């Protein structure tokens, strides 16, 4: 990976093999999406997330694997279509903090994605991509959250200043 020329270290790596063809995808040190073909061990294409999103908060692959699901250190959610080689949509919600992880759930199907991050109190935020809403939000608290705060954030822009949490309850691991 030092052959990139900028000497970038691999952040996160996810590989997949379709009966059609097999390949791998990884995030650079500058959080840049690069999909290398497993067959030829060469780079098929290089995708780059907008600098306004900060860095890559997670890595996930679509069911058809024609699309990449990546979170943002700016506390945004970005799904991109590798087919047309562009960014499909950019989403945000809650307290607008950093996204712990992002993945595509099984029972939720490809039409819904599970993302840990966003609002503080909320442990895991599951939102349906097409629906543009969060169907199920698991939160640790003694009371029900605000409906206006839980509503999907769209009109917001890159001007938002990053606010995270240094608490010990932040970093965690999840497998589904």
């Amino acid at each position: 990976l030092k052959n990139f020329g900028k000497n970038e270290y691999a952040v996160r790596m996810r590989a997949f093999v379709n009966e059609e063809k097999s390949l791998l995808v990884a995030l650079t040190n500058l959080s840049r999406v690069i999909i290398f073909d497993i067959r030829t061990l060469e780079r098929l294409q290089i995708i780059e997330n907008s600098p306004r999103h900060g860095a890559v908060s997670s890595i996930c692959i679509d069911e058809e694997c024609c699309v990449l699901i990546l979170g943002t250190t700016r506390g945004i959610i970005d799904i991109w279509d590798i087919r047309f080689n562009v960014l499909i949509r950019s989403w945000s919600f809650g307290d607008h903090a950093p996204i712990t992880h992002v993945e595509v759930c099984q029972f939720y199907g490809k039409n819904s994605v599970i993302v840990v991050g966003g609002s503080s109190k909320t442990f895991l935020t599951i939102w349906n991509f097409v629906k543009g809403h969060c169907q199920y939000a698991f939160i640790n608290s003694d009371e029900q959250p605000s409906m206006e705060h839980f509503l999907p954030i769209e009109k917001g822009l890159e001007e938002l200043n990053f606010c995270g949490i240094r608490s010990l309850n932040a970093l965690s691991t999840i497998s589904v």
Partner: peptide, 25 residues
């Protein structure tokens, strides 16, 4: 862009430092 790169890196490093601090705790 070259500017903001440092901001993003600062964010990531901040996250890592937070996790490490929690581990130390």
């Amino acid at each position: 862009l070259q500017k903001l790169s440092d901001q993003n890196l600062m964010d990531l490093n901040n996250i890592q430092f937070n996790k490490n601090l929690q581990s130390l705790k």
